[PDB]
């Protein structure tokens, strides 16, 4: 298939009021520090703080070229399975579904880790 699909439709804008309604979650981007994946964790760490300054997003270790996302310290969506290509709405809707107080998407882990040759 193609990497493209549903490009950016929204436009830019100035810094809105200062409110952290998304407070109530602890994001934890698990990635291989000693690899060079920070380029992605820093590109969002500057946009996540301007959105939800109330939450708490820290950096943790993964293992090797990994990017296990943990909206609440628990892997809910791996990047080594899909192939990457995240979404600004997928990284922001994490706390919106977690802080909601309702069950979130879980994995049964009935299959091995989708490798890549």
UniProtKB/Swiss-Prot annotation:
BP term (GO), one: negative regulation of apoptotic process
Propeptide residues, chain positions: 115-117
KW NADP (keyword) present: no
Comp. bias regions, Polar residues: 3-12
Residues found modified as N-acetylserine: 4
Lipidation (S-geranylgeranyl cysteine): 114
InterPro entries, per database record: Selenoprotein_Rdx-typ, SelW_related, Thioredoxin-like_sf
Description of post-translational modifications: Isoprenylation facilitates association with the plasma membrane and enhances the migratory phenotype of cells by inducing increased filopodia formation.
Keyword terms: Acetylation, Apoptosis, Cell membrane, Cytoplasm, Disulfide bond, Lipoprotein, Membrane, Prenylation, Redox-active center
Intracellular or extracellular location(s): Cytoplasm, Cytosol; Cell membrane
Top-level division of the source organism's lineage: Eukaryota
Gene Ontology cellular component annotations, sorted alphabetically: cytoplasmic side of plasma membrane; cytosol; mitochondrion; plasma membrane
Region (Disordered): 3-23
Disulfide bond sites: 32-35
Tissues in which the UniProt entry reports expression: Among normal tissues, present only in Leydig cells. Strongly up-regulated in breast cancers and in brain cancer distant metastasis (at protein level). Up-regulated in prostate cancer cells and in the higher grades of prostate adenocarcinoma (at protein level).
Pfam family, one: Rdx
Membrane topology term: Lipid-anchor
Oligomer status and interactors: Interacts with GPX1.
Protein purpose: Increases cell migration by inducing filopodia formation at the leading edge of migrating cells. Plays a role in regulation of apoptosis, possibly through control of CASP3. May be involved in a redox-related process.
Family under the similarity heading: Belongs to the SelWTH family.
Protein known as: Migration and invasion enhancer 1
Native organism taxonomy: Eukaryota, Metazoa, Chordata, Craniata, Vertebrata
Gene that specifies this protein: MIEN1
């Amino acid at each position: 298939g193609s990497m493209s699909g549903e490009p950016g439709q929204t436009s830019v804008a100035p810094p809105p009021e200062e409110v952290e309604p998304g407070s109530g979650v602890r994001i934890v981007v698990e990635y291989c520090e000693p690899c060079g994946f920070e380029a992605t964790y820093l590109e969002l760490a500057s946009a996540v703080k301007e959105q939800y300054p109330g939450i708490e997003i820290e950096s943790r270790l993964g293992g090797t070229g990994a990017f296990e996302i943990e909206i609440n310290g628990q892997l809910v969506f791996s990047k080594l399975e899909n192939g990457g290509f995240p979404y600004e709405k997928d990284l922001i809707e994490a706390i919106r579904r977690a802080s909601n107080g309702e069950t979130l998407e879980k994995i049964t882990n009935s299959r091995p880790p989708c490798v890549i040759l």
